[PDB]
Amino acid sequence: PIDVSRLDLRIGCIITARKHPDADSLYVEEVDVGEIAPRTVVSGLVNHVPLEQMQNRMVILLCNLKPAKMRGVLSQAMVMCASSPEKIEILAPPNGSVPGDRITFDAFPGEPDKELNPKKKIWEQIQPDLHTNDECVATYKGVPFEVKGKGVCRAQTMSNSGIK
């Protein structure tokens, strides 16, 4: 059964971020996801978000993709953003969210896969249905990204836009 419940979406905090020394379009980040050690993440947002806005930034991360090396750096998660050709916006968790908080969906209960099998293209089948609301709230087929007891996740200005 393929729906968003397969995904392991968690709240995290960017501890530190720096530009990739051999790639101007990528950032290398150390992210606190509530685990014992931080996770290293490689994100292509240099041309959209100033470095100063990355430090101690609360984000939403896809955590069960198979780790892959990006220009020589092992990326262990993906930062979720609302995106269009003109601009990109990092999705924001509700106030009070802390690293490790999990995102759940009202209509899609279930446990996420231990690790998404790249050969099955599961992320690829779910991603197309992820999009923000008319109210800029992040959703999967219209069902809001929820942090139980805290609120919903949202973009700042991008409504009705895909999420990647």
Helix (H, G, I), strand (E, B) or coil at 62: strand
- 120, 87 contact by CB (below 8 A): no
- 114, 83 contact by CB (below 8 A): no
Resolution in A: 1.8
Cβ neighbours of residue 29 under 8 Å, at least 6 residues apart? 14, 15, 16, 17, 18, 40, 41, 42, 43, 54, 79
Indicate the fold that domain 1-164 takes in CATH: OB fold (Dihydrolipoamide Acetyltransferase, E2P) (2.40.50)
Cα 99 from Cα 113, distance rounded (Å): 20
Give the closest residue to 57 by CA, choosing from 93, 102, 25: 93
* Way the structure was solved: X-ray
Distance, first Cα to last Cα, the chain = 21
Domain ranges of the chain: 1-164
Cα 127 from Cα 47, distance rounded (Å): 23
Cα 77 from Cα 38, distance rounded (Å): 11
Cα 154 from Cα 36, distance rounded (Å): 27
Question: 13-41: b or e for each residue (b if 16 or more CB lie within 10 Å)?
Answer: bbeebeebeebeebbbbebbbeeeebbbb
Residue 64 CA, chain-centre distance (Å), reads 11
- 97, 119 contact by CB (below 8 A): no
Cα 123 from Cα 130, distance rounded (Å): 11
